[PDB]
Design a protein around this ligand. Sequence first.
Ligand SMILES: *[C@@]1(=O)O[C]([O])[C]=C1[C]
Length: 321
Amino acid sequence: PQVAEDCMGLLQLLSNGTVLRSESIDLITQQIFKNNQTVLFKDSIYHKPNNLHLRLYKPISASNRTALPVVVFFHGGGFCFGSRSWPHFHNFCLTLASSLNALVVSPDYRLAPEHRLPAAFEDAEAVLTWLWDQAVSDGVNHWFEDGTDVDFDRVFVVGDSSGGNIAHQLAVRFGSGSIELTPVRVRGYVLMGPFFGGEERTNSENGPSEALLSLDLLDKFWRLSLPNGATRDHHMANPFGPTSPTLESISLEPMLVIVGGSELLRDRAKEYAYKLKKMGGKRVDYIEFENKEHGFYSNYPSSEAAEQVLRIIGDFMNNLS
Ligand SMILES: *[C@@]1(=O)O[C]([O])[C]=C1[C]
């Protein structure tokens, strides 16, 4: 059907996103006559050939008091959907910058099935390299109109869903020594409902569907984003597949895994965290929010559970800074 060549172009338009001309500001309400705060943000290209952009967020109050830590946020979308400019993700990043008092980097990455995996992992590394280039060239001073003091020794990666998988890949590439980006130092990783996969199903994966996520949809994501002929046991989907790099040899940074108690992916995430803990010298914290489904932290901002995730991530950063 010619309408098939048409839905193809719908996803592309849907996730293409727009680019801000100049820097912008927004008012964000604080935790608990609402207390508010301003956040400065703007888009920048980080990979010219692919026309890939990222958004920089700076909480104005905190930036005028101390050097800011860096949070690199990778949005979700099953490797097939999403843009940094989507209000859903833009709002979460505003909350991240303001609540964490951190400079937030929110990059786009190429989406499947047009750009199958590992296209996205390749883009995530380009983001970190772009950050290195900015750190060693005083590019940070030109990020916004005024100056900005950033502490590249305190970088944290926060991955949501498919972005959580991305974060794991980066943690492996760094922990293995395959790449090194002094003076950029990634002190920890946060995996929110990480999009991990596997040929065999877990208990939770076999449970009832969620409000939006179903096993069929997850399988659908994997087979649109994995290379043709690959199974869900490929290392890009399963962190402990037959060819998955032995994480015992590599030294993983401190990991924080956060999932909802009612998530399809809860079991795979729990299995992942406990396999790391019982691996030696691995600081891995696992936090399960009872009765919550996938993406609660971003689907319901200003909800009590979302605010607790923010607090936990901040305490995680403080303990490592
Ligand atoms: C993602 O990025 O992975 C999951 O399939 C759903 C989201 C969100």
